[PDB]
Every structure is written in C-alpha cells, then in structure tokens.
From a paper:
In about 60-70% of newly synthesized proteins, the initiator methionine is removed by a metalloenzyme called methionine aminopeptidase (MetAPs). Type Ia MetAP is the isoform with minimum sequence and structure required for the catalysis and is present in all prokaryotes. MetAPs have strict substrate specificity towards peptides with methionine on the amino-terminus. Here, we report the discovery of a novel MetAP1a found predominantly in the streptococci bacteria with two new structural motifs one of which may undergo posttranslational modification of glycosylation and phosphorylation.
To further understand the relationship of the two inserts with respect to catalytic domain, crystal structure of the SpMetAP1a is determined at 3.2 Å in the P65 space group with two molecules in the asymmetric unit. The overall structure is similar to that of the E. coli MetAP1a (EcMetAP1a) adopting the pita-bread fold. Since the crystals were grown in the absence of metal salts, the active site is devoid of any metal ions. The metal binding residues are well ordered and interact with each other as was noticed in the human MetAP1b apo structure. Although the overall structure of SpMetAP1a is similar to other MetAP structures in the catalytic domain, there is important difference near the active site. Not withstanding the confirmation of the extra loops (discussed below), a β-hairpin198-211 (equivalent region in EcMetAP1a is 170-183) undergoes a conformational change and occupies the active site where the substrate methionine usually binds. In the new conformation, the metal binding H199 moves away from the active site when compared to analogous residue (H171) in EcMetAP1a. Due to this flip of the β-hairpin, residues in the loop region are forced to occupy the substrate-binding region. Hence, substrate cannot bind to the enzyme in this conformation. The insert region (103Gly–Gly132) forms the extension of the loop within a beta-hairpin. The tyrosine kinase phosphorylation motif (124KKYT) is also well ordered and structurally placed closed to the glycosylation motif.
Numbering used by the authors:
A (entry chain B): 1 to 198, 208 to 286
B (entry chain A): 1 to 286
C-alpha cells in the first residue's frame, strides 16, 4: 500500500527493524560449515518467543499450501522463498535468510498474545490478522570461505541494492531506482530477476525517470535478486514456493526498508554501518 | 495509491471512462489510410473542450521534457509513449492510441473550471491535481487492411488482456492475472514487455494502480472487493527489450524492430467478478 505512514507507524517499524536486524547479527555466529540449516529457523523461532514477536510468514497462502516456516532459506541457485530444512551447510555454500517479523506486542485477552509454546509448528492465523508493525528483510551469507564467484556476486547485489537506495531521494521517481539497480548489476554480466516483480516494494529494474514520484513518509523495501548470467526463474512444481534459477547460476539477494525523508532515505532494518556487512 | 475506494468514487471513473470510450469509437472512422496522424490529437483536443475534460498527459513531469500531448500515438514498432505528429497513415500501419482524461468538470472562477481555451500548447498544470476522476486506456487500431502478422498481434494482445481480466476475481492474487496474461501471449512465441511498469505508471498518469502482464500465480496482493485496477499488455513479435528515445526521453520502441501492440482497460473488483469501467461495446467485439 502506497499511502503514507504517520510517525508512530514509522517508529513502530524501526523497532521491529531493530529486532530483525539483531537476528541477522545472531546469524553470523551461526551460519557456518557443518551446521544444520534448520538451526536458522529455530533461532528465529526461539527469539520470537523470547521477545514476543510474530513470524508473519507462517500461515500465508499458496496455490498448493500455506507457508509453513517463519523463515525462507534460499540456498545457492535457489533465488527466493525456499524452505529451511534438515541440511548440513557446506563451506562454499551461499545461503539467504528472508523473514518478516511482527511486534513487539504485549499480552492480554483474546487480542494481545503471550504467544509462547502455542504450536509454531501448526497453522494458526493470529498472523494474517496483522501484528501492528513488522519488517521483511533478507540478508545473504557465505558459509565458510566463498569462491570469487560468490564474493563478487555478493558485492554487486549489495552495492546494487545500496545504489538503489542512493536514488531514494525525495522529489524523484521509483523509475530512478530500478534503473540504477538495473544498470549496476547488468553492467557486469549479472542478470537481474524480473518474474517476481517486487506492503509496497520497489522493482530492481525500470526505465529511469519513469515511475511513481516519491514523497516524504513512504516506506519502501529494496530486494535485489541477481544471477550469474541469466535471469529466468522456476517455481517449484510440487510446493509452488521455492524458486531456483533456470541456467543453474547462483542468485543473491539483499533487502532493507527505508523512509523517504528530506535529508535523504533512512533505514530501519540496519545492522549497523552500511556496506560493512 | 494501491488502496480501496469510495462507491461514488468508482462511479466517477465509469462516467469518466464513458467519455474516453466514446472518443475511441469516434476514432474508428477517423483512423484511415491517407489521414494525417496529427488529427488524432486535434480530435481528442477538440472533444476535450466540448465537454470539460482535461487531457492530463500534458504537463506530466519528465526528464528531457514534460509530456506535451493529449495522446500517445504509438506506431508499429513503437511500443509506448510516442507523440502524435504529422504522419500520413499508410494502409497496414498498426497504431496504438493512449489517453488520460479527467472529469467531467463544471465551470467558473473559484468553484470548478472552464476549459475552452487554455491554449493546450502551454505549461498547463491544473492537470497535476486530482482532476475529479478519470481514465487511462490505450487502444489499438489497424489502418486500412492489416497484414496477417498484424491481425494476430492485435488479436493475441486483445485476448490475453481479457484472459487477464477473467482472473481479477475477489480472492485471487495479482500474480494469477499477470501469469495468465504472460502465458497466453508467450505460447505463440510473442514477447511480453517487462522493462516498464512505471511501477504504478505515474508516467503519463497520476498515482493509479497497475497490474503487470507477467508473474507467478502467487506473488502479489490478494485482491479484495472495491479495488480498481488498469491492465495493459505491451506485446511484441519477438523481442521484449525496448528503446527509450534519447532526444526527448519518452518513446519506447522494440529493440529488434519487431511490431508491438497494446490494449488497455480498467475495472472494479466486484463480487460478480470484475466489472470493466472503460468499455466501448461488448467485449471481444471491437
């Protein structure tokens, strides 16, 4: 939804962005060679129960089925929306952890959840009835030590993302972002995903000076999906969720949420110093 | 903005779409071989004056320059946002006419405006101010008798769009629409454009939502009753890649020199299904 947010709904979000940010920070100490990808789900699982946040990915619809996990764990050639699973990570692996968390909410009647060991394992929609403030935010991680293949892939996806941001300046068109993102990644061989066309969201591609003019108070998210070479994407036939690349290439993806603001864009989902993680 | 609406707010658009449709029908007679394309503008200009309807595309902001015309007269291998101009229409040319018009609007000083002469050649930005309700809708035209290559191009886009509409039923997602649009055209090795959704087409516009003509059958807003959306497939023979004019910064053109075509409607998400707000007949027939 495009219509602007009042400063409290903004504040709301930075605090969920605070939280989100911290899971990502806990994750560094955990995404390593030999560990069961599944520890990722459990960590967010665990940390949601401790500080009373909702994993709002649990219960969302699908042609096939609703989304079972709190987390999406897209590994390597998996682009996005893959599941977390029993899998021992490897040195060299590239792993992406998207999630959307809502809170922090207190506790009370059949309205305000205590939210502990209700069965995160099962198909309850307190979730689709929204938890006030939230944040999607995917962040990528090289498990162990990465090929140059990877290191490079990741840097571009990253700077690409932050270059989009750079253009998120008041009095300017969304066109000017996707444009920017497009150019950067695309001017190095890397192909950008289009088939997912990314609460509102900006696409990673477009003709510059050719979109919605940006206002103060809009909160947007930038979610670059870049591939080695080629950009076409599958949709898991069996679950209608996971997306792998088509040419076998790798895909990376970084993602924040910001506010348009005289003085320029301001990030809510920041894990500290930008470009240093 | 991608929210819901009012009930009379819906109304305004149908009434504002009643008018744009009428133009489009008017044009059927107009668009013959031997006719100067510029007529399409002057005509539209003309009818915009006779009822108070502002042509909102004039003054919409842009880089190299603001859009200066009531219409876009895209032509053959031009896919979108090309100017009307003096071109004398060869038999077999494929011409796509896009417009945005707001109103109708009553008259006078500080209570609703008069519109005979603003000089429609000026820096006339009343246009950039919610000018009541309105309607965007491109439509495609064959000048004279159209090749087989063209006949199909026009027919496949026309249908693909209506196939999109079919999906716009309360409780589907936007994905479902764009997917099925994508599929239909792509199944005859037609190309579908992606490089521009102006995501929300605030280009040649102000604010209104835009479903994209490609996607996955999940990845978008589940669509509730009361949403009003436009839909507009640019299709190409062959390549979906697109120019953008360097001199003026508007006109988009197929990369390989193929032909492109575009149709467009808007509609409300009612609970009978979707009710098309910009109709100029019974559907499939025009």
């Amino acid at each position: 939804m495009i219509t602007l947010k009042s400063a409290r709904e903004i504040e709301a979000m930075d605090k969920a962005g605070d939280f989100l940010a911290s899971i990502h920070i806990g994750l560094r100490d955990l995404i390593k060679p030999g560990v069961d990808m599944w520890e990722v789900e459990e960590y967010v699982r665990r940390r949601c129960k401790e500080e009373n946040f909702l994993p709002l990915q649990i219960g969302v619809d699908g042609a096939m089925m609703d989304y079972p996990y709190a987390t999406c764990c897209s590994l390597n050639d998996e682009v996005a929306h893959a599941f977390p699973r029993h899998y021992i990570l490897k040195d060299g692996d590239l792993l992406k952890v998207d999630m959307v968390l809502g809170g922090p909410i207190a506790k009370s009647d059949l309205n305000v959840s205590k939210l502990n060991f209700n069965n995160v394992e099962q198909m309850k929609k307190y979730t689709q009835s929204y938890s006030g403030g939230l944040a999607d935010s995917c962040w990528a991680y090289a498990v162990g030590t990465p090929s140059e293949e990877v290191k490079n892939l990741m840097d571009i996806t990253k700077e690409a993302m932050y270059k989009g941001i750079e253009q998120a300046v008041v009095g300017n068109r969304i066109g000017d972002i996707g444009a920017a993102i497009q150019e950067y990644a695309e001017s190095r061989g890397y192909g950008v995903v289009r088939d997912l066309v990314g609460e509102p969201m900006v696409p990673n591609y477009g003709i510059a000076g050719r979109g919605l003019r940006l206002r103060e108070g809009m909160v947007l998210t930038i979610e670059p999906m870049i591939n080695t070479g080629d950009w076409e994407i599958d949709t898991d036939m069996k679950t209608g969720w996971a997306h792998k690349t088509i040419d076998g290439g790798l895909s990376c993806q970084y993602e924040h949420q910001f506010v348009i603001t005289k003085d320029g864009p301001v990030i809510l989902t920041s894990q500290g110093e930008e470009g240093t993680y």
